[PDB]
Amino acid sequence: SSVPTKLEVVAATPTSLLISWDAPAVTVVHYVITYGETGGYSGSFQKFKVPGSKSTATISGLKPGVDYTITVYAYDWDSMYSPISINYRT
Amino acid sequence: SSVPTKLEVVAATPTSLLISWDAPAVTVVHYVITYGETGGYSGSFQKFKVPGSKSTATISGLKPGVDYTITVYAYDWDSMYSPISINYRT
Amino acid sequence: QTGFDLSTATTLFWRPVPVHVKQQDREDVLEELTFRILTGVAKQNHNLRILRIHISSDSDLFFLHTLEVSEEDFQSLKNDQGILVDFASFPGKIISLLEKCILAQPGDSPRFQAVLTIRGGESVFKIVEINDEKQLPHITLAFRPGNDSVVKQFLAFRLSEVKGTCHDLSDDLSRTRDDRDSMVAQLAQCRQQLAQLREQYDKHLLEVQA
Amino acid sequence: GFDLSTATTLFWRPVPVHVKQQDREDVLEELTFRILTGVAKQNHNLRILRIHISSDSDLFFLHTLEVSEEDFQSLKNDQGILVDFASFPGKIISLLEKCILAQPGDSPRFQAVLTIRGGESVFKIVEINDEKQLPHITLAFRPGNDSVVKQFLAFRLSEVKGTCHDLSDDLSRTRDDRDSMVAQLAQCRQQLAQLREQYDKHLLE
């Protein structure tokens, strides 16, 4: 149920992004962040993993001027909470 | 053989003992400690489990004046290091 | 070689949902089943798009029902099967329906429920609106029960998953231990300075007192 | 049937083994050997020993051997064992250790080779002096069907999950200890600063 409280964008680069979320009180073993072109199938967004203690992450390799989807999912044992997502353009 | 090469009995009371090992160089998620009287032919040794963070362990309820064989095994995720064993009477 | 590419697949829903399972034994029961919804691409071609759903049990690790659909065969199930959606938003709406199944009490006017009927070799999963004697399938899907091979592969995938999560936890544990050691050292430093300052203050007080 | 619940693990490490098969050509791969001593759930006095050969690379690779004490007497005459059922693991581990610490400069050149021929597999540890080859131990392993490999994966996932929960508890514990240290640090700096302002206010007199 939108496990990270709120999300913000902080970076300002042509090829990358830097995202910041906030620390939910629930047990989170890890976070997964997905970045893909908006309107895409979403089965090619190249996921990457972030520790549950951390609240920030850097994305790389993006094409400038494309609409990219950034989604944060937090995982428990045997479960995954509902994600919260934002979209940004370079 | 023994991954820690450093197991000894360090405190001693007629019904209890304190064992201390040294295995911090390798990644150790947990240790299993087996304590039983007889040497070999072990169908009644009491095992107990200890986190890899610890370097000490207390055994209690032991019979006074008896010979115990105590063995420490260190485990990884996909492996188990070689054990170390001692004999002590308390 | 293998059709679907789980390595770079995206997990959109992974949560236990209340499901009614019906079998020919007639032992109708409500069990909490874990649904994992994955969007990915085939390893043969990056243009072939697949959606796969896994119904498993954390209680029974040998219970698995699988669904795999491409973008092309999606036309067969777009018509004749459920509400009108494109291949893209079908995951979203199915996820919304499953979530409605989770937060479903009898007093809910649209009491959405989920039922999995397993008959021999095939199983059909349907989410149904069940108020005032209506049974309305919002979504109807067909699931393949697990053979030993596919359940074996699923178990292996989850084992590698858990291994990676636990290695990450070990890294975090070493880091937090280092942070705590640094904090206790800083605590000792502070207390030492506080003791020194209390000494100087007491000496100053005794000097003024004389 | 063996009861892993009350079993003790004596050796669980990757071992250098040369695996030769009829379908694929000769390769040297590092294989994980797990040796377990335990007792049966039918009779807690009856003793069984189990050995597992797996791969951390290939999770579908499983070869198992389990022996009772009686048929171990049969294998004592079948391979000339001169030690008891209890200490046999020790010799096996020593043999495996000799393979583990085995380099080209080794005179005994203790080696491990496993050949699988369609339902049958034999694992052999060998002494290689000049060209003569003396197998110290020869054992027969039944390769895993999908059912037993499935059960093995399930048990091993339960193990990883349990150890991981134990690590999670320890992580929570250390995080709490760190929070306690941060709180004590805040208290200490607070009283330091206020006693310094008291120092200077007493300088005001």
Author numbering:
A (entry chain D0A0), B (entry chain D): 2 to 91
C (entry chain A): 13 to 222
D (entry chain B000): 15 to 219
Q: Which of the paper's sentences describe this entry?
A:
Centriole biogenesis begins with self-assembly of SAS-6 proteins into 9-fold symmetrical ring polymers, which then stack into a cartwheel that scaffolds organelle formation. SAS-6 proteins contain an N-terminal globular head domain followed by a long coiled-coil, and a C-terminal region predicted to be unstructured. Moreover, SAS-6 homodimers can form higher order oligomers through a weaker interaction between two head domains from neighboring homodimers, with a ~40° angle between the two coiled-coil pairs. Here, we developed monobodies against Chlamydomonas reinhardtii SAS-6, characterizing three in detail with X-ray crystallography, atomic force microscopy and cryo-electron microscopy.
